[PDB]
Amino acid sequence: DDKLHSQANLMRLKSDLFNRSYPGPTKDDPLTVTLGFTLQDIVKADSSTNEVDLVYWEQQRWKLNSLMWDPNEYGNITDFRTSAADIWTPDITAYSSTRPVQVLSPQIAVVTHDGSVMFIPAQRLSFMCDPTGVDSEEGATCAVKFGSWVYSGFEIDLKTDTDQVDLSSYYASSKYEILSATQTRQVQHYSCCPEPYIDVNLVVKFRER
Amino acid sequence: YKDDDDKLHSQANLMRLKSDLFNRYPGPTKDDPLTVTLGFTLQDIVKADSSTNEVDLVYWEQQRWKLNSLMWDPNEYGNITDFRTSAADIWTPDITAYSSTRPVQVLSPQIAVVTHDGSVMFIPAQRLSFMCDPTGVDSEEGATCAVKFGSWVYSGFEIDLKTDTDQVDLSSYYASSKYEILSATQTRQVQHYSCCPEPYIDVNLVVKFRER
Amino acid sequence: DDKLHSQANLMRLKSDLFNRSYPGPTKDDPLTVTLGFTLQDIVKADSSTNEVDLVYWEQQRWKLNSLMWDPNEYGNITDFRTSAADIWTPDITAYSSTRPVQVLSPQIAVVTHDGSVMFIPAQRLSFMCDPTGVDSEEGATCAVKFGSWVYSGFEIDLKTDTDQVDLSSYYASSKYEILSATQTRQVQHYSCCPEPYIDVNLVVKFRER
Amino acid sequence: DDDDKLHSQANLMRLKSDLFNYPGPTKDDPLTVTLGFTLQDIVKADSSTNEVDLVYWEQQRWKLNSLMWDPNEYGNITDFRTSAADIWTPDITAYSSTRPVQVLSPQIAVVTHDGSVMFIPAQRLSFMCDPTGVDSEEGATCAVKFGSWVYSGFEIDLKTDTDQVDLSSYYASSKYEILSATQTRQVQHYSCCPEPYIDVNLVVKFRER
Amino acid sequence: YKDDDDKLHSQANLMRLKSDLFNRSMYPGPTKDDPLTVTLGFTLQDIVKADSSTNEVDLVYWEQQRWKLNSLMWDPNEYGNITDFRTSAADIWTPDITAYSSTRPVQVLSPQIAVVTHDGSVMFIPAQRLSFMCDPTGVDSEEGATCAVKFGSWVYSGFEIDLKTDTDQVDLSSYYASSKYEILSATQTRQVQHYSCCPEPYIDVNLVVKFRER
Numbered sequence A, C: 001d002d003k004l005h006s007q008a009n010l011m012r013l014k015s016d017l018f019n020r021s022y023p024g025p026t027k028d029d030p031l032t033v034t035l036g037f038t039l040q041d042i043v044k045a046d047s048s049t050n051e052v053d054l055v056y057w058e059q060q061r062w063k064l065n066s067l068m069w070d071p072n073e074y075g076n077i078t079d080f081r082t083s084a085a086d087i088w089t090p091d092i093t094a095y096s097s098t099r100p101v102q103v104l105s106p107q108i109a110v111v112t113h114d115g116s117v118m119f120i121p122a123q124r125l126s127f128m129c130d131p132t133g134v135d136s137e138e139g140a141t142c143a144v145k146f147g148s149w150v151y152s153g154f155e156i157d158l159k160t161d162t163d164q165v166d167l168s169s170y171y172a173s174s175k176y177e178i179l180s181a182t183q184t185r186q187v188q189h190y191s192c193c194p195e196p197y198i199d200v201n202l203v204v205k206f207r208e209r
Numbered sequence B: 001y002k003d004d005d006d007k008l009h010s011q012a013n014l015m016r017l018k019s020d021l022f023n024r025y026p027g028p029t030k031d032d033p034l035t036v037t038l039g040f041t042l043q044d045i046v047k048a049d050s051s052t053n054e055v056d057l058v059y060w061e062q063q064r065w066k067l068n069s070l071m072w073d074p075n076e077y078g079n080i081t082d083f084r085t086s087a088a089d090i091w092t093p094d095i096t097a098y099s100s101t102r103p104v105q106v107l108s109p110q111i112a113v114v115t116h117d118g119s120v121m122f123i124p125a126q127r128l129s130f131m132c133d134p135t136g137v138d139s140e141e142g143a144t145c146a147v148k149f150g151s152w153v154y155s156g157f158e159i160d161l162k163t164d165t166d167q168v169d170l171s172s173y174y175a176s177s178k179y180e181i182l183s184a185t186q187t188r189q190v191q192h193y194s195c196c197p198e199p200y201i202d203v204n205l206v207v208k209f210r211e212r
Numbered sequence D: 001d002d003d004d005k006l007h008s009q010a011n012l013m014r015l016k017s018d019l020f021n022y023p024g025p026t027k028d029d030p031l032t033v034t035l036g037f038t039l040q041d042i043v044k045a046d047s048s049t050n051e052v053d054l055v056y057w058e059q060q061r062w063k064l065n066s067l068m069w070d071p072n073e074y075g076n077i078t079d080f081r082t083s084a085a086d087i088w089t090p091d092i093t094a095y096s097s098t099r100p101v102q103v104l105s106p107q108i109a110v111v112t113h114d115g116s117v118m119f120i121p122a123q124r125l126s127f128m129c130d131p132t133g134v135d136s137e138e139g140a141t142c143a144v145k146f147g148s149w150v151y152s153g154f155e156i157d158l159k160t161d162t163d164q165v166d167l168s169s170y171y172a173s174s175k176y177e178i179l180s181a182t183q184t185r186q187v188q189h190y191s192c193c194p195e196p197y198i199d200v201n202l203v204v205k206f207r208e209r
Numbered sequence E: 001y002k003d004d005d006d007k008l009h010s011q012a013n014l015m016r017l018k019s020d021l022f023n024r025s026m027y028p029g030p031t032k033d034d035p036l037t038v039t040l041g042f043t044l045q046d047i048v049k050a051d052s053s054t055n056e057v058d059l060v061y062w063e064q065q066r067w068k069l070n071s072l073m074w075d076p077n078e079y080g081n082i083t084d085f086r087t088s089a090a091d092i093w094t095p096d097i098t099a100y101s102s103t104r105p106v107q108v109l110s111p112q113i114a115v116v117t118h119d120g121s122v123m124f125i126p127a128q129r130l131s132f133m134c135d136p137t138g139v140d141s142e143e144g145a146t147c148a149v150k151f152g153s154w155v156y157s158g159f160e161i162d163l164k165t166d167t168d169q170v171d172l173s174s175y176y177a178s179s180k181y182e183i184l185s186a187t188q189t190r191q192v193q194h195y196s197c198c199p200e201p202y203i204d205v206n207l208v209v210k211f212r213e214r
Ligand SMILES: c1cncc([C@H]2[C@@H]3C[C@H]4C[C@@H](C3)CN2C4)c1
Pocket: C148, C149, C150, C190, C192, C193, C197, D057, D108, D110, D118, D119, D120
């Protein structure tokens, strides 16, 4: 019965939240998405096509008024897990991939009572990269931008929580050593559009182990 | 609390607009034809395979069209001038590469932008393998290949294709590609086939390239 | 208002047809499918596995009473488009593929007021084929049967409009040239089932350009 | 005649409606599945990974009281086709595959008025096999077992019509020729559990052509 | 006709049971207030391929998962003496156990069907092919090569899902006898680790395999 009670409280929360009266962000109702990368592995560097294959965890975080609740009204529940399909998620995309991203983890988000969401898909990505110099001490340098496909900086702003990519889980016996890995918010002016555009630029310098 | 009420207000206006529009288009017909504007942004020639004569491209395919049924007065909807929506929520054109050798791979979210004048813009990123003899790519002259894009089931009487320019946009071409672009054009072609009285329209993407 | 009139006539037509009171063909209500192939490219011939990859257009046509209408009753509309997934379509299958067929085009059918349906997918198909001889003047010959996977000749019959496969859209700079290509109706019996099954046999003779 | 075609069509729709308005087999309600293979091709024998790739047709038959009807009550209809998704199908699985099976045919089944079902998916299968000896006169030998993943012999009894694999469609210009192919029902008894477990062992001996 | 009725009878009893369990008023997954223990057991069937150009190895294994829920208990006496049943894994909550270092999406080789027993226990055993991060250097020597991959919930911390094994010993009794690689050693071990994202501990089972060319 006690177990039944906490389960009903959570079901009540989710029912309350998911039947509320979210169309995504707008210039009137903008959103900030925080991005951070945890680089696991540079799997392959193909010098015949200039593609490199990375494996990483991409941490996304955003906050929505419509996902807030007072834990006191819901049995002291302070967070819950739910399918990422149950909620709005941002359309963060690599801007220079050469193959569809392959998702390596379940698509499940953690929602917290302050309305914040954490969603961390693991991905394998092939992106445009010239690995010349990777067989040298200086190594090779490559970069890929991540951002919304269709929202401007007026509707979705981005930030990182740190400039430094998390290398604490980088595979110690990878074919490639990381010499440095940074992630930087960029502000772009494009001649085509009045709106500012924002991306996060992931830059990795690496060489053969 | 006032700030919260204002967000809900804007959110409610957008949901009312979307609800109004998606409860009101069966695709183009001879009586009601549609002009679709195409433009390519070429990002990369990834691979040129001389053993199979396939060449792989990455590009952004901009598609634009305008429907009366998607029009609205911003004054009636909280001054909203446009919105983002799933491409599955609206009709989209069946523009197809005519000489692909693999199903095209989509690299971007399939989300379109709709503006109050009824115009839609949809720009999927794609990787395409298509029929191309790369002979000469290892030379100053380079190699030349072409692929036509057009509707699968609509003739020129139902969908007219336009380009805004004959010049492919190369301002985002990957600087360290294995292949450099000598030229890239996109040309509207009107075709008359012996099989059928109705005219056909395609856009011919012609790319000249060589090893960097 | 005129445009809305045109559009309303089209929706009325599809509504009327879609709500009729077609379960597929039966022995009492058999169907004839016209099948035609147009070859675009022999992409690859693998002599290590005896698999060859072909790109082609497969033209399928059939006619249903239930899809007929009088254009006078419907604003003179003579035809319309529908997703192939929204109507019954014949389960035409290559008998000797070695990988799932890959679809290179939209799956959209054209329905005409006389009740005829035209569906023309572009496909890439890997099938069983020994390319020995392809580097000689006489080339190599291969064949693949196409037919309904589950309907016998008593429910689905097949016909061609011509025995000669159209080569005029064949890729002029393919690694392989076509020496001949024919398509022929065949009737076959298998131990599993008492009824005959119909196929169209595609026979292609080809060699290195 | 248009009325007659609608008549037979209505009869079929009525039948299907009646039938499609079963929790799987149980110890109290057991089911026999008959299996037979038609081996079409050994496509590939990979001595670098000890994987061999087979293309075959897997015939499955079983019968359910819930699918029976009197043809006299339904316009003399004696069978019909229906999507395999519309009915229960057995979970027959290869026990040593190394890749997900690739489906090469439409998933459509044939139901007969006696309640029997015939379902014959064409598949490409990679499975565990050491092809050592394949380039010799004696050839190589490989084996793979098929059976239910989750049902015991008290729920699903497996049977074959014949211990001979059907070779009547084996690709005559395969890279590999068949020396013999058998499909043998095996019953195993285990000390752990009161119920017996059943499989069909597919054994193929083959060599380079 | 009596037998036909009896069959219908047992079928109705099973459908009644399933309808009753799947409409209970609903298991929302584990929480800090209602935590769950998941037992894992690995059966290694084959090392298919070792790729020294990319340091990726491909395994085939069966991943046995077991857990128990109150909401899935019934009295067999109330349901025709039914003591267990099979059901699609989509009909029930299942744990999001994930390899932490795969390099390609895991491929499932077996039907997604679970077995539920009257005491509320569940057994789900998917067969999988996995590519993961692994340096095969040494595989062609007597000492062979050693690699490891962690398995754990992707989104549930140790406060919601505890993972356990029953044994250190990876089951090798169905390992392919003519594999390109023979297994020198295989162990499965529970671990607790912290990550940058969160303050909570996450639990994994570490699968360690020593292998060499046969
Ligand atoms: C009946 C039901 N499903 C499939 C079939 C198959 C069988 C194998 C092959 C030939 C014939 C028999 C029709 N078709 C293709 C028949």
